[PDB]
Amino acid sequence: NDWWDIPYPSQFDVKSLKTQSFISVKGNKFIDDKGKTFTFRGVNIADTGKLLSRNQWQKSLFEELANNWGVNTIRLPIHPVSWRKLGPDVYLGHIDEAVRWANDLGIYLILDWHSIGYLPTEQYQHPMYDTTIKETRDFWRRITFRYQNVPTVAVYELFNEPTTMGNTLGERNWAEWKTLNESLIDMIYASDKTVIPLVAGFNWAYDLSPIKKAPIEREGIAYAAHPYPQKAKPEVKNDKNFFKLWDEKWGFAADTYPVIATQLGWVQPDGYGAHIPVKDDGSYGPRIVKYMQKKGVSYTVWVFDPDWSPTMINDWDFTPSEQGAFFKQVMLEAKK
Amino acid sequence: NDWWDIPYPSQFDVKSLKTQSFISVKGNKFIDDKGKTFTFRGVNIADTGKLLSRNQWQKSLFEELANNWGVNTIRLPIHPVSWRKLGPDVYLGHIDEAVRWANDLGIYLILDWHSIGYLPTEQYQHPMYDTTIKETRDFWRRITFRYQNVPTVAVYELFNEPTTMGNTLGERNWAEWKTLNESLIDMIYASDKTVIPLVAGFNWAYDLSPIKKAPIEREGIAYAAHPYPQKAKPEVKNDKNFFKLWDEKWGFAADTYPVIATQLGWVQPDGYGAHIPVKDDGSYGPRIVKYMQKKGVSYTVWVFDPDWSPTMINDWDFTPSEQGAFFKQVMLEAKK
Amino acid sequence: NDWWDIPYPSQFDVKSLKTQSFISVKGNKFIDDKGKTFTFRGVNIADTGKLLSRNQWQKSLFEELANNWGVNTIRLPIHPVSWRKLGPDVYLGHIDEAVRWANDLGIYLILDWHSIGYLPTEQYQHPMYDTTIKETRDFWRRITFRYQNVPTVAVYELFNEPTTMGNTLGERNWAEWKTLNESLIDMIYASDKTVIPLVAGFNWAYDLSPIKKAPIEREGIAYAAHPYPQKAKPEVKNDKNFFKLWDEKWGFAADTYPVIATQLGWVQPDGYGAHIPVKDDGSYGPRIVKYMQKKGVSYTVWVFDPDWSPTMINDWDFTPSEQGAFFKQVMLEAKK
Ligand SMILES: OC[C@H]1O[C@@H](O[C@H]2[C@H](O)[C@@H](O)[C@H](O[C@H]3[C@H](O)[C@@H](O)[C@H](O[C@@H]4[C@@H](O)[C@H](O)O[C@H](CO)[C@H]4O)O[C@@H]3CO)O[C@@H]2CO)[C@H](O)[C@@H](O)[C@@H]1O
Ligand SMILES: OC[C@H]1O[C@@H](O[C@H]2[C@H](O)[C@@H](O)[C@H](O[C@H]3[C@H](O)[C@@H](O)[C@H](O[C@@H]4[C@@H](O)[C@H](O)O[C@H](CO)[C@H]4O)O[C@@H]3CO)O[C@@H]2CO)[C@H](O)[C@@H](O)[C@@H]1O
Ligand SMILES: OC[C@H]1O[C@@H](O[C@H]2[C@H](O)[C@@H](O)[C@H](O[C@H]3[C@H](O)[C@@H](O)[C@H](O[C@@H]4[C@@H](O)[C@H](O)O[C@H](CO)[C@H]4O)O[C@@H]3CO)O[C@@H]2CO)[C@H](O)[C@@H](O)[C@@H]1O
Ligand SMILES: [Cl-]
Ligand SMILES: [Cl-]
Numbered sequence A, B, C: 001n002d003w004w005d006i007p008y009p010s011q012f013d014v015k016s017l018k019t020q021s022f023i024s025v026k027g028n029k030f031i032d033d034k035g036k037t038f039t040f041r042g043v044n045i046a047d048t049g050k051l052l053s054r055n056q057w058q059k060s061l062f063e064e065l066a067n068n069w070g071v072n073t074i075r076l077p078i079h080p081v082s083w084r085k086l087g088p089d090v091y092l093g094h095i096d097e098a099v100r101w102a103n104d105l106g107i108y109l110i111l112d113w114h115s116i117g118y119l120p121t122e123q124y125q126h127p128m129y130d131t132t133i134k135e136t137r138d139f140w141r142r143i144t145f146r147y148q149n150v151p152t153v154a155v156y157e158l159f160n161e162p163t164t165m166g167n168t169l170g171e172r173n174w175a176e177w178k179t180l181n182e183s184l185i186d187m188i189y190a191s192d193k194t195v196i197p198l199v200a201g202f203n204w205a206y207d208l209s210p211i212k213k214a215p216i217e218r219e220g221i222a223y224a225a226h227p228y229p230q231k232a233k234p235e236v237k238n239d240k241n242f243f244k245l246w247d248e249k250w251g252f253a254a255d256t257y258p259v260i261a262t263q264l265g266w267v268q269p270d271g272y273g274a275h276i277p278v279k280d281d282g283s284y285g286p287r288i289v290k291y292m293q294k295k296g297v298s299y300t301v302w303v304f305d306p307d308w309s310p311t312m313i314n315d316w317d318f319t320p321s322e323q324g325a326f327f328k329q330v331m332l333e334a335k336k
């Protein structure tokens, strides 16, 4: 009742972590603080609240991924509805757990403010993604204060998937989106300059082409890409044609800035949760991996969860799905 | 609890309706899809929630109006407080009923986002009208998706009565209001181009004069006018002087665009719920009807309800008030 | 349940007050309506809700201050969280009490919308200060309507302490802040032109220097200053060096506009609730009083409360603290 006695917030205790290299941006590459080139390779897990509700928010989950799936990175898709439902204090307390778990395993976290829609008009694809510019700023303000100087938390992915859904949500306007990302980056850098902001384009974070002429005017950032199989639609389906289309919309970015494909994956058109744009016969797997390997692109596969699709696992015993078995071997081999 | 299992929305089933002409804008006229000039002539009823609370939300209400009062149109004043109180899903479910009822009777609906105040500062005449730009956009987003390709729903009246109340609510600024209406129209047209947006001026939707120099830069729209009796204040009260004042503030619009007088009416200064600007000795009735007839102006009288004033009916047996008996005969004669 | 029956608001009954001079702005001075120069000299009390919760919201509080502490002014720091918690109707009802109490004692009130942070991004120092541009406008709309033509309520302090906290809350931008204050002033002046708006600069209302080149372009306003002891940091601590630094950041304003130091005070570095920027050995007391006396600056000391620091009183028997005993004698002597 005494609102005047509500405490000011505290910061994560960095002394509680074991030594872990910071990742930073240098030119078009990530590097660690030993100066070695670094690639994020890993997976999304589900929202923290979804996992808690079925008692699957456990260090054992992180251990499975680190020990058996070859990941060096986990992306946490923090859904605004879940952020509100647990409330900031409880959600941050669970993020703290993820930090300790990842640190102990020597892996890194991408914190993703997981909305879909058009923030400047505050209209979204679905209520679970609902937010405001105010809440979005406040999220990043809180996150940046709490995890200041924490090497485990490497990337702040400002807004998962910008889209206006054919301008039903507003008029897509690069200049206003650019300005807003720059505004968020400024709040972040005022609080912690050691973190990597990740910025996305339109068409559900597929289209980075506006940065050819109007890149975000801030240093030390990276760009997101979500190159699902059906985003590029060549008439003739082969490596060369897909590569050219990917080149044009997002791959070119990797020549100048670091790029993380923070969502990618596929399921068979008749498989579990099959929907546009994730339907593929499986030929996309080797093709996107080859493409990313050639361009030095980082990635986190969607999704290491048995309910949300396309799945990497069919159950909580971690039985691999088609894409799961494929990416697991890719990541194990890369780790070598 | 599982927010991730909350369904995506569905659209009204157009196959459930009987054949009904679409109304569209051509130049300064409405026409039906047989190419014949069309005039909206009808009434407002109360907010859906008010009617539900006294069990008056019934097809019989629509039947009374269509069969005995000669209407071809009903305006639904959706109050934002009621929208929130029933919640979108339940409110839309009742709008669905209105659509089926009106369609069956061969009449049309105007959906009116019924707020009073200044949306750009989000300040209003009364809490019952309280909203935000975000909620207003979301309302129109939901409405346009749900009633796509539904002929019965003819007009989307974006914001009932713009006013700053002597600039106590903000600084009235045509350019910012124009831009915001254009933004809403763009969201709507991205989703359904077969609907007619209705745009209002300041001074409680009385003053359209800014469109002489700066009309909304979008095709297929109409303009609202609320010419209550005491809005124009000639020193000498006659046809000629009122006509000239109406000409100057709103009637001129009918020369170039279609105009719907979506609110109009009167009660005696000593009658039920008498207040500025609806007080009149009754001479306004024939005068506004003559004026509208000469200019081909569409109209929906306020209000076909026994509680809200000025009333068209004194009870739920539909006993006519003074203005009610007057307008009933006007509409019956026009229908012939 | 019947939202349509929710009453429109009413105004404070001015006939309930005894005769009391209006205070107005003339050049760089306040004057009363007898044309005599006037200086606000008094204190802050705690938020109305805090006082109510411990049964300390009583006329006896105002009587103690007027009769024994020599005040002619009390500042009410209305915290947005408390505004929401009591709700506008109940909070305004208690403000009405303060008005009657102050009027009877011949003292004046400053109503302070008591937030800390950056309103244009709606990010704040602490949740208790949380608000929006919409809520802030609505507060001033309600206040200005209710207390129209009430001499007892002299000053509307638009936003207590603007700060971006090292730009962690947003990018401080004088031009956008200026525009927003002008917008609030316009809402206020549209409703009551007899009230004095009080505008603040950045750095927790310490830095008025932007008004040298870009003052608020409205007449009849005053400027706030919060010159706590540790805001100016001269290497050599004496009258001359502090005076020069105060001159440069806020004191210059008093040459052209009226200035009210609506928060000021100190506690010993080892005293109760000691924190930056209010720690001082006590030499600040005579120095700030001398400075303000020379420049004709008005002031309300923070704070006449035994819980909130720095205190003027150590208990509810009004036992004076160090700064309390000091300021009490200053105010008693000035009153003579
Ligand atoms: O968050 C929990 C939820 O996630 C679900 O997956 C999401 C997925 O994360 C998201 O990327 C995906 O977005 C797609 C849209 O749904 C889809 O409409 C859109 O299609 C467009 C077409 O409309 C357009 O014509 O063409 C392009 C290219 O073909 C296409 O993108 O594509 C985007 C992605 O780019 O939405 C998913 C949900 O539908 C999980 O499936 C679910 O289990 C979880 O609850
Ligand atoms: O929504 C449920 C509610 O509706 C009530 O009627 C409303 C009516 O719909 C609305 O148009 C009307 O607005 C008027 C303002 O109330 C009135 O103040 C304003 O007056 C101005 C003057 O202030 C100005 O000086 O001059 C002009 C011209 O004379 C004048 O307009 O006029 C507007 C309309 O233009 O408000 C009504 C409520 O007061 C029902 O009466 C009620 O039963 C329902 O609950
Ligand atoms: O509202 C109830 C609450 O009030 C508490 O006092 C507030 C006080 O009213 C407010 O002015 C004060 O603001 C100070 C900030 O807290 C402080 O961080 C800031 O420091 C900056 C430094 O960060 C900067 O480096 O330098 C400058 C100059 O030295 C300095 O200002 O200073 C501002 C004031 O200018 O915050 C108090 C709370 O911390 C009561 O103490 C409490 O009991 C009540 O509950
Ligand atoms: Cl898009
Ligand atoms: Cl107006």
Ligand SMILES: [Cl-]
Binding pocket: C162, C163, C164, C165, C166, C172, C202, C203, C204
């Ligand atoms: Cl500041």
Ligand SMILES: [Mg+2]
Binding pocket: A147, A148, A149, A150, A151, A152, A153, A154, A155, A194, A195
């Ligand atoms: Mg970090």
Ligand SMILES: [Mg+2]
Binding pocket: B147, B148, B149, B150, B151, B152, B153, B154, B155, B194, B195
């Ligand atoms: Mg339609």
Ligand SMILES: [Mg+2]
Binding pocket: C147, C148, C149, C150, C151, C152, C153, C154, C155, C194, C195
């Ligand atoms: Mg006053």
